[PDB]
Structure formats: structure tokens, C-alpha cells
Design an enzyme around this catalytic site. Structure first.
Site, short mmCIF file in Angstrom:
data_model
loop_
_atom_site.label_atom_id
_atom_site.label_comp_id
_atom_site.label_asym_id
_atom_site.label_seq_id
_atom_site.Cartn_x
_atom_site.Cartn_y
_atom_site.Cartn_z
N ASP A 179 30.92 0.90 23.43
CA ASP A 179 32.25 0.28 23.38
C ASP A 179 32.59 -0.29 24.76
O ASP A 179 32.33 0.35 25.78
CB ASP A 179 33.28 1.32 22.96
CG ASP A 179 34.57 0.70 22.48
OD1 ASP A 179 35.57 1.43 22.36
OD2 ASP A 179 34.60 -0.52 22.24
N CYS A 213 33.30 -4.39 14.79
CA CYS A 213 33.01 -3.32 15.74
C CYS A 213 34.20 -2.38 15.46
O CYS A 213 34.52 -2.14 14.29
CB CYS A 213 32.95 -3.83 17.19
SG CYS A 213 34.07 -5.15 17.73
N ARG A 219 32.71 -6.44 21.02
CA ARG A 219 31.31 -6.57 20.65
C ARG A 219 31.11 -7.68 19.61
O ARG A 219 30.17 -8.46 19.71
CB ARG A 219 30.78 -5.21 20.17
CG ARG A 219 30.68 -4.23 21.35
CD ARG A 219 30.49 -2.78 20.95
NE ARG A 219 31.74 -2.18 20.48
CZ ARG A 219 31.84 -0.91 20.07
NH1 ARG A 219 30.77 -0.15 20.08
NH2 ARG A 219 33.00 -0.42 19.67
N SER A 220 32.01 -7.76 18.65
CA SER A 220 31.95 -8.80 17.62
C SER A 220 32.04 -10.20 18.23
O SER A 220 31.33 -11.11 17.81
CB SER A 220 33.11 -8.61 16.64
OG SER A 220 32.93 -7.41 15.89
N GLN A 260 35.74 -8.81 25.45
CA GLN A 260 36.72 -7.93 26.08
C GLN A 260 36.54 -7.54 27.53
O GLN A 260 37.40 -6.88 28.10
CB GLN A 260 36.89 -6.67 25.22
CG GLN A 260 37.74 -6.92 23.97
CD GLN A 260 39.22 -6.89 24.30
OE1 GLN A 260 39.75 -5.84 24.64
NE2 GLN A 260 39.89 -8.04 24.23
#
Ligand SMILES: O=C1C[C@@H](c2ccc(C[C@H](NC(=O)C(F)(F)F)c3nc4cc(C(F)(F)F)ccc4[nH]3)cc2)S(=O)(=O)N1
Ligand SMILES: [Mg+2]
EC number: 3.1.3.48
Length: 296
Positions: A179, A213, A219-220, A260
Site C-alpha cells: 500500500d 486496490c 496502485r490502480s 498517490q
């Protein structure tokens, strides 16, 4: 892109570059997502789909699901980015897969990360314990599983109990992507992306692949940005013309927060630059990514 990459590395300006994208990103309303009756359908209060691009469920009661249609017009590929389903939205999730006619689901997180729940166990882990989503009238069965060192590919059968129609859904599960982190290497990420591509799941013959995710943005977003850039390089037949920051801004018109951390942005450059070799005709780099990934 490559010289821009080295330029940014030399001066250590990844954070500045990433913050500029955040400052420039689109801001559209998310009224539906913020309605009181939809509070229990959102995993995170600060991650919501824009009203203009949200996916609507085909049900009268409440058509809301925290999911966005990222429609990349020039590249000619669409993706549905959604949060990891909650215990009460797994039926909604498969209803969306069914209605949008998706052939594949790409999962980039694990159900539990660092001791906390990040996604519901929305698919069957055992062949003999199929799942029924009564609220949605769907049945889901695990047919088989191909387990590799850092990812797993599952064959699922999704059935509309009302019509008795059945469909095979491929589940591509990247199990080692931390993450707020990045893949172990460009090679392991690309080997995974090409496994999804070779499966046929991203074909325009099917509905949009569903990518998620935990929140469906970090992550997506990394996964979709790399795929779209590589696709755009070939679509234009001009790899050097692809501006990754511009592509990321275009994608952010459809869902907030894609990519992110500044390091995920940096990794995106790395993956696209390495992936450009395959686009440029190198017919051996794919087998090299596979070896470097150590999937066995
Ligand atoms: O790489 C990633 C990041 C994940 C992610 C998880 C959860 C959120 C929403 C969560 N909301 C919430 O926790 C809450 F609803 F607002 F409380 C969230 N985690 C945060 C951490 C920071 C950080 F910079 F300090 F790390 C900043 C803002 C944050 N928002 C966003 C991305 S992913 O599943 O999208 N993949
Ligand atoms: Mg068994």
C-alpha cells in the site's frame, strides 16, 4: 520522457513534479457519493467518484457504487477503477461486473495489509465453497487458480441466477504490491501487465476491465497510467510523443487521486520507459521480464 526522467532524478524534483500534478488536477462534484444514504457504500470519506464518470448500477433501489469509468478516448481503452468492496457492497461489485460486461478483474492489494482490513473477501478461495450474493441474484464459483510467486490468476464463473447465463471472469491478483508503495521492479510489473493483456481481458470486445486496490486510486492509478501510456505510444505510432504527466492529468478528469505518491509517479516513468522497448519492436524483452520477475 527518459531525459526528462534523468533530469528530474538529478535535481531530485519528483515531489515538486508530483505536487504540481495534484495542484493541477481536475475537481468535479461528487454529490451522489456524498449523500447520507450512500455513506456505508464508501470505504473512505476522502475517496469518491465524480458524478460525471461514476458507474451506475442497473437497480432502482440505489444505483450507487464507489467506481469510476476512466474513458481514455485517444488510446481507445476504458477501465473501471473502484475501491476494494465492503462486506455490504460485494453484491454491488459483481452486479457492476455483470452489467458492464467486464471479462477481467485486476486486484492490486491484499484483503489484509499491515494488520488492517483493506478489502472484503469478495471471491471464493475454495472451489467447493461458492458464493451467493442474494441481494444481487448472482452466484460466483472458483474454477481454478494459477499461483505464482508474486501474483495469482484465477478463473471464476459468474452466474446470473435469474437468467442462468454464465460467464468466465479472469481475476489477476498482484499480491506483493505494498500500500502506498511500488512493485519490486519494472520487470515484475510489466510481466503482470502483459499477462493481463495476453489474456484478452482488455479487448474492446469486452466491457471495461475492473481495476481496484483498497481505495482504487494509488496502485490502480499506477497500473492504468502505465497501460494507457504504452497503448498510446503504439496507437500514435510515436512513442516519444507521449507525455506521462499529461496522460495522468487526463485520467484524473475521471477519478480523483490517481497515483498517490511521488514515488509511484517515478515508478510509472520507469515502467513506461522499459515497456517502450517492447513497443519499439524488441521481441525478446518480454521473456526477459518474465525471467527477472521470478514468478516460479
Ligand atoms: O497506493 C495506494 C494508496 C492506497 C490508499 C488507501 C486509502 C486512501 C484513503 C484514506 N482515507 C482515510 O483514511 C480517511 F477516510 F480519510 F480517514 C487515506 N489514507 C491517507 C494517507 C495519507 C498519507 F499521505 F499520510 F499517507 C494522506 C491521505 C489519506 N487518505 C487513499 C489511498 S490505494 O488502495 O488507493 N493504493
Ligand atoms: Mg481444496
Amino acid at each position: 520522457m527518459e531525459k526528462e526522467f534523468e533530469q528530474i532524478d538529478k535535481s531530485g524534483s519528483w515531489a515538486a513534479i508530483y505536487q504540481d500534478i495534484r495542484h493541477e488536477a481536475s475537481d468535479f462534484p461528487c454529490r451522489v457519493a456524498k449523500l447520507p444514504k450512500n455513506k456505508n457504500r464508501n470505504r473512505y470519506r476522502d475517496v469518491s467518484p465524480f458524478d460525471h464518470s461514476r458507474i451506475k448500477l442497473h437497480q432502482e433501489d440505489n444505483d450507487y457504487i464507489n467506481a469510476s469509468l476512466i474513458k481514455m478516448e485517444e488510446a481507445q481503452r476504458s477501465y473501471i477503477l473502484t475501491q476494494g468492496p465492503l462486506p455490504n457492497t460485494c453484491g454491488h461489485f459483481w452486479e457492476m461486473v455483470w452489467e458492464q460486461k467486464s471479462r477481467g478483474v485486476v486486484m492490486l492489494n491484499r484483503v489484509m495489509e499491515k494488520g488492517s482490513l483493506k478489502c472484503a473477501q469478495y471471491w471464493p478461495q475454495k472451489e467447493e465453497k461458492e458464493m451467493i450474493f442474494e441481494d444481487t441474484n448472482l452466484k460466483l464459483t472458483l474454477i481454478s487458480e494459477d499461483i505464482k510467486s508474486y501474483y495469482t490468476v484465477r478463473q471464476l464463473e459468474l452466474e446470473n441466477l435469474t437468467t442462468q447465463e454464465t460467464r468466465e471472469i479472469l481475476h489477476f491478483h498482484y499480491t506483493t504490491w505494498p500500500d502506498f508503495g511500488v512493485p519490486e521492479s519494472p520487470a515484475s510489473f510489466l510481466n503482470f501487465l502483459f499477462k493481463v493483456r495476453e489474456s484478452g481481458s482488455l479487448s474492446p470486445e469486452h466491457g471495461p476491465v475492473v481495476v481496484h486496490c483498497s481505495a482504487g486510486i494509488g496502485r490502480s492509478g499506477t497500473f492504468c497510467l502505465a497501460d494507457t501510456c504504452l497503448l498510446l505510444m503504439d496507437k500514435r505510432k510515436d512513442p516519444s510523443s507521449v507525455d506521462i504527466k499529461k496522460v495522468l492529468l487526463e485520467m484524473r478528469k475521471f477519478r480523483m487521486g490517481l497515483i498517490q505518491t511521488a514515488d509511484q509517479l517515478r515508478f510509472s516513468y520507469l515502467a513506461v520507459i522499459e515497456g517502450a522497448k517492447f513497443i519499439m519492436g524488441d521481441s525478446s524483452v518480454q521473456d526477459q521480464w518474465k525471467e527477472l520477475s521470478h514468478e516460479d
